[PDB]
Amino acid sequence: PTYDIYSRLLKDRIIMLGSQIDDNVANSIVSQLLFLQAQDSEKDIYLWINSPGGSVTAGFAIYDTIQHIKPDVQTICIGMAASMGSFLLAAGAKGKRFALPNAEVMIHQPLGGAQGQATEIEIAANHILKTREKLNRILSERTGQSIEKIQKDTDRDNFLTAEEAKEYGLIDEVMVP
Amino acid sequence: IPTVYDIYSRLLKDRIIMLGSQIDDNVANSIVSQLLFLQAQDSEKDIYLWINSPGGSVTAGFAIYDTIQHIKPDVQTICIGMAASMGSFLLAAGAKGKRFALPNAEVMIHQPLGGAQGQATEIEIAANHILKTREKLNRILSERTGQSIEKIQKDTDRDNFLTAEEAKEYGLIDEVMVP
Amino acid sequence: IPTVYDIYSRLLKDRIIMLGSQIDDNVANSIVSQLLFLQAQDSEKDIYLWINSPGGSVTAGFAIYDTIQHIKPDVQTICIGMAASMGSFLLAAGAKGKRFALPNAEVMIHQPLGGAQGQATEIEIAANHILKTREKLNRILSERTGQSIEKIQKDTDRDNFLTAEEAKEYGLIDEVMVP
Amino acid sequence: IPTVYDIYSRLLKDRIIMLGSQIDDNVANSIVSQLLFLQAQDSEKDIYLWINSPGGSVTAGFAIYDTIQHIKPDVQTICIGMAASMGSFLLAAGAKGKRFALPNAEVMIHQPLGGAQGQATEIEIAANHILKTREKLNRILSERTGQSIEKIQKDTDRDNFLTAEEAKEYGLIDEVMVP
Amino acid sequence: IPTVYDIYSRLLKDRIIMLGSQIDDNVANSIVSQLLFLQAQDSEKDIYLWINSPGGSVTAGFAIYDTIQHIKPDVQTICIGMAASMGSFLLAAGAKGKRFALPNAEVMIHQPLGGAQGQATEIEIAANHILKTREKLNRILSERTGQSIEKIQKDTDRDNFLTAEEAKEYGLIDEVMVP
Amino acid sequence: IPTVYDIYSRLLKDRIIMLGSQIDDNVANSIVSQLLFLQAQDSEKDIYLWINSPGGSVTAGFAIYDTIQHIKPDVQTICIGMAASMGSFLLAAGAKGKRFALPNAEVMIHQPLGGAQGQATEIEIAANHILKTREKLNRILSERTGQSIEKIQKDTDRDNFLTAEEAKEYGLIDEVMVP
Amino acid sequence: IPTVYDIYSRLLKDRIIMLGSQIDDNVANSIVSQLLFLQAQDSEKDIYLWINSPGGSVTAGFAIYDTIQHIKPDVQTICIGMAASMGSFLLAAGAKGKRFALPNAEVMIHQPLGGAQGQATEIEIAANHILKTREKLNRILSERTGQSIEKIQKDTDRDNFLTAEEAKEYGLIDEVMVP
Amino acid sequence: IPTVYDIYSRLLKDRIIMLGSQIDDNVANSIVSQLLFLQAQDSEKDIYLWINSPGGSVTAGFAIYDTIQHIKPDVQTICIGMAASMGSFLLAAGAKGKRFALPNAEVMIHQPLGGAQGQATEIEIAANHILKTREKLNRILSERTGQSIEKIQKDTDRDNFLTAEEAKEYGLIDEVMVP
Amino acid sequence: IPTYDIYSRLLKDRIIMLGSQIDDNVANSIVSQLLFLQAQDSEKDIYLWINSPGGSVTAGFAIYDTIQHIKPDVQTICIGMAASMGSFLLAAGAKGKRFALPNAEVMIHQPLGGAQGQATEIEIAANHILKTREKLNRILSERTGQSIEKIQKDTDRDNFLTAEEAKEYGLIDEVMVP
């Protein structure tokens, strides 16, 4: 409905990540984070996440912009945070990462593709393995789990309840009503 | 869509939210935003969620469900036309005593739908996840209807069409709004 | 669509709602919102529902039907061009004495259409549901026309085209609006 | 489409309605709304319906036709470019003495087109309906042109192209507007 | 298709003709050629027409029908699997006393299907032709079954599925071939 | 297609030619070759041209027509199933007294179909050519049926469906072959 | 497909018939022809029907079923790879004591699949027909397995995968052929 | 492609069967027929199954596997190019001591692949079935290789590419055939 | 294709045509022809004529191993083009009996492929195609006399050779002059 509803929530420092993460969505979220820091460098931002994931580089545009700005960015999972979505949920300010009780969190390894000559396939494989090491290291730091446990637990699609995500260290609290 | 504000925005000003389509992430994110906005405008006055939906994404439905239970205002639910699948789940999720259907509205309940492709172990993970999702939906529907988990399981095995009056007998709504 | 307000929004200001397309959930949700808005503006003055529609979704049609019967104002119905299937059902649903057609407007009645694919038991569920839907439509049409259920069943077995005058003799409308 | 209001909205302010496309339900609903609005603004002053149309839906055309005959103002018709099929029917439907074409405008008359698929009895129902529709169009064209039903039937058997002057001799218009 | 001659050619040597597909002109021309060839080989010995067909072209079916009635040998008909529409017509066309179905074979009768597009008068010609075709099929079915034309008309209004035993009671076949 | 020689080659050995498909250049060239071959085998014995065809190319049809009239043997024609358009023209082209239809065979006559695209003068050339083609077909049909050119023109204006008996009354065939 | 005769034709010479694909009318007509041919060669010696099939048309399957029961020789059935749906029905239809599966072969039973679109009464006819077809399949499966109709109904409600040993315990086969 | 009998048929005369494609029902039915034919020609002499296959249908693979174990002759297996998935399963299924690979041939083992769409309970049935299929494949591979079920499970979790020499160390073959 | 068809008449003289892209179907046909010719006569030369843009590496290795396996020498003759696995099979003919006609083209390059899915699936596919390349390069080294390092460098991109250059490289033994 139409300020449109999202613009009115942005006035209260609420950003919606409510779709697949591509470059357009990431550029919108980065712009909103930068704008909110300029409006007030001290007050919390609320990043609400309902996303099946998407582009790793687009996800890292959002991740780095969160860590760059001065305000704490709270994260709240509603519905689902899968893949890069769950990475960004875990990237919220320490003590301010939440999920609502019936929200789902899914973690897994990065997906990609490579076509062409053996040496091109080698370059693409080395790059996606380095990307996975980078994602896993940051998830280790943000969850408190070892790199070896994160590697094993992301080998395949791993679905967590809100409560299990909290036990894992992906969030700090389940927001009960 | 006519203007007075477009018609939906004018109804939102009176705390009326329309769920009038298939439930996907875009629709859920719109409904969640409207619920949060209405709570900020007035944390005490009732909200009116009108439902004409064939259902859709279970996770999108749960974004709406958890946002309803999270906010302070009671959310009334009114079924007009049809509430099927996740649509009927959200109809049942309205504030106790304030779940309604108009007399010719249809309610349909059934088990979740999905897909799985790839290696045996990937199919196993997808099967375990959709069975756990069904247990979660059935448990909440049990709490909101007063029916046993075993009855909900049996009654959702296939497409199960209810009249407004049958939805009330089932405990999915509290009253049929007669004219 | 020209401006004066777009033309439809200007008509809505005079309590005129246009049903001028196929009936789907989006069209029904727009019409329901307009009916609720007009009731809130004035609970006593007539509303004018103008119908040029080939029909569409039965559940979407029932969202409109139940909203008409729910609100306090009389809803006049006027058929201009064509009212077929759920369109003719909604024409017959207007306030008693205030259902009209212009002289060359066409009214068509027929049984509901649908589909079913899959297992024998899924086809059985879909068949039972569409037969119950037809019984529901025929019962209400009987009440609104004064015709017996048996006559409506026979007369809707196939596409049945009526002139405005025949629709009036049938009891689908009260008057032909002559110039 | 330029601005001064878009150009069509500025013409509507001077009681000029453009029928400049294929006739479907959307176009008919727009024209009907404009006729009703112009009658509400002034029930006495002429309306100008300018026609450049290859025709289209018969029922949509009849929505326009009946709305013209219903309202109190005279509706002048002016053919610019082409009036074919239902377009030429609506050209002939203007107020007596106020139906015009510009000198190089084309008018085409022909019988209605359709289709029918399915069982023998469904094909029979569709054939009876389109023949009754043709009888209805031909009867009204007879009344508005002064030609006999037999002549209209023969002259519409195939595509029949008329000059502005021939349309006037036929009684489809009253005058060729000379510069 | 195996070899021994392909299997169908070996059966043709024993005066067995297979109608095992949809009836089109190619299938009909093959069957007509086989009937003529078998009559030339021996004008006295029975021919065996085995039918597993969902039907198809009425004119192609009548090529087969008239060729059966034309030649001197009796043509036995045996339904194996299904004889629907023109397939069931040809099953009923076998020599009196020599029309069979195996116990689980299905017979379906219904009215002819077709289509028509274009001008009202083209649709009228197509409708008249398919109604005359239906009268022709029903008259011959009346003669071959012993049922009245009125009963055949009513019983073919919609898809009518018969067991082998019901086909025999109806007079479409003379006997169920039991093992 | 079964073997005994394939079935068509065995019938050709008895001077039977099948025209059992749409007439295109390939079908015409096959039929012309068969007529020439049969004349070379025996210049005195009758040939039997069996026709089940919806028609097709006029020039391909005239390849067959002129080859029939050119060779010394009489060519009998037998309509089985349907002879439409150029098919019915070739049925009428059989030796006088030896043109037959089976009782339930259908005959259809109508004017030629075609197309034209491009400049006005190209469309004029294509229109003149198809009108001259129609004059040529109607003149020959007049000679073969005994009907006047004026009657053939009127009767072929639209699709005209004939029974075997009506085809005989028209002079398209000499006899209905009764069983 | 190699030569020695193609390999299938060489096996047919030893009274071995391959059902190694989806069951459609073409496959059924081939199998029916092979059964009839083998009975004519020797009315006493066993026939070997080897089955690796995901199923297919129920009427095509019944053409095969009835032809098996009709002929005098015992037809052994051997499941190699998979017998699903109509495939498992035909496996169960082999001569008593001569129905086999190899140890790793899979048998799957489930209810028939179909579809229906159109008017409520057409959907009702299609639903009644597929339910009657399922009763017919279940009755015969009851007779051939020794299981009750009610047990077969419950066990075929969804896809039910059996090992060779489970198929034997069920009564679908008599023995697992061990090496 | 080449003739001498096609080249494959000439090799079959020397008891050589070539599996050079994806394993589907058609390929499996051809291989099963060739194995049965060769056993009938000589129940004692070795058969040579040469394998270059990326795998395919598990049930089709098991048709071949069970037919190999059923017949009396030893079936040697020789991998040339690649044996992946069901291809490598069949390579391992050759007579003990007579399973070979040429030095540059690749062997790949991995878990079965599939898919499932629909209701939670349908996905559960499909998941249980593919997990049971994997247990069956792994048990037989354990028996034929000498590896534990737990090692086979771990080693097939993902695509596992082996050289000829590694396949021999694993127990999938007995020897690398050096030139 | 004229009439035995012409290819079957050449097969009667122990001539096999590899005249298309190499896939499993073509490899299975060539393997069958090699086995058939060995059964007809285990001593006389076979003539494998190659006009092929290459194709599947595993299909190519089915042909390669079948050539080395059978007892007869298999001569190779390049007519038109031998690219990729085509040029690998040209180099695989019996020592001293690998030929090209003077205007025939030979092209060598590294293997092509693809990989989709999880990081670990991409890793498995990359390791496999790199091992396949090491295997091709090692065999080409043995058959040409060039070092593995030179073959690696020379196959990094599409490398087009004349018949004479293919002979200097050791991919063939002689240019068949008229």
Ligand SMILES: C[C@H]1C(=O)N(Cc2cccc3ccccc23)C[C@@H]2N(C(=O)NCc3ccc(F)cc3)CCC(=O)N21
């Ligand atoms: C910090 C510095 C800078 O490096 N950038 C680059 C930049 C560009 C786009 C996205 C970024 C995301 C993360 C980090 C840097 C990004 C822009 C920024 N500016 C502001 O932040 N200006 C307040 C502002 C932001 C948004 C807005 F809408 C209004 C004002 C203008 C003045 C300036 O020096 N800077």
Ligand SMILES: C[C@H]1C(=O)N(Cc2cccc3ccccc23)C[C@@H]2N(C(=O)NCc3ccc(F)cc3)CCC(=O)N21
């Ligand atoms: C409750 C708390 C919080 O955790 N969030 C996070 C959040 C973010 C996105 C979606 C959510 C959905 C459900 C529950 C929390 C969600 C936002 C909220 N805020 C407000 O509600 N602010 C008034 C407001 C809302 C909307 C509007 F338009 C204007 C004002 C900002 C102040 C604050 O502490 N909170």
Ligand SMILES: C[C@H]1C(=O)N(Cc2cccc3ccccc23)C[C@@H]2N(C(=O)NCc3ccc(F)cc3)CCC(=O)N21
């Ligand atoms: C005559 C009567 C009525 O039956 N209708 C229904 C109607 C709807 C659509 C098209 C129609 C065409 C022909 C005839 C009736 C049509 C609307 C009309 N109204 C007006 O004309 N109101 C001034 C008005 C109209 C439009 C506008 F933009 C402003 C004012 C509202 C008051 C009222 O009683 N009526």
Ligand SMILES: C[C@H]1C(=O)N(Cc2cccc3ccccc23)C[C@@H]2N(C(=O)NCc3ccc(F)cc3)CCC(=O)N21
């Ligand atoms: C009757 C009751 C209620 O159950 N609903 C639910 C409802 C929601 C959506 C569609 C419906 C359709 C038919 C029937 C109920 C529908 C809304 C209504 N409200 C109003 O009608 N409010 C005036 C209003 C409407 C529109 C507008 F722009 C301004 C005010 C808010 C206060 C309230 O208690 N109610």
Ligand SMILES: C[C@H]1C(=O)N(Cc2cccc3ccccc23)C[C@@H]2N(C(=O)NCc3ccc(F)cc3)CCC(=O)N21
């Ligand atoms: C009865 C008469 C005739 O009108 N025809 C025309 C005809 C043609 C095609 C299909 C037809 C189908 C139904 C009825 C007539 C058909 C052919 C027939 N002939 C034979 O039957 N000849 C023995 C014969 C038949 C088939 C065969 F393979 C060998 C010989 C040639 C001699 C002859 O006078 N006649």
Ligand SMILES: C[C@H]1C(=O)N(Cc2cccc3ccccc23)C[C@@H]2N(C(=O)NCc3ccc(F)cc3)CCC(=O)N21
């Ligand atoms: C009549 C004359 C002639 O002008 N032609 C040309 C011709 C060619 C192609 C199609 C034609 C169609 C219609 C009319 C002429 C056609 C061929 C014919 N010939 C024969 O008929 N030869 C016996 C023959 C024919 C066919 C066959 F299979 C065996 C012998 C060669 C001897 C000869 O003088 N003639």
Ligand SMILES: C[C@H]1C(=O)N(Cc2cccc3ccccc23)C[C@@H]2N(C(=O)NCc3ccc(F)cc3)CCC(=O)N21
């Ligand atoms: C063992 C028994 C049997 O159960 N079958 C069924 C069967 C059918 C299809 C595939 C099968 C695969 C594996 C096992 C059984 C298979 C066929 C077999 N027969 C032969 O093997 N006959 C020699 C033969 C075969 C083919 C051929 F061309 C010539 C001779 C016919 C005589 C007989 O009793 N049997």
Ligand SMILES: C[C@H]1C(=O)N(Cc2cccc3ccccc23)C[C@@H]2N(C(=O)NCc3ccc(F)cc3)CCC(=O)N21
């Ligand atoms: C029993 C009777 C009959 O009703 N038919 C019809 C029929 C046709 C096709 C499949 C059928 C399957 C089951 C039952 C009837 C079937 C054909 C059969 N005939 C034979 O079986 N003939 C020996 C034969 C068969 C095949 C073959 F290649 C050679 C000879 C011709 C002689 C005869 O009276 N009959």
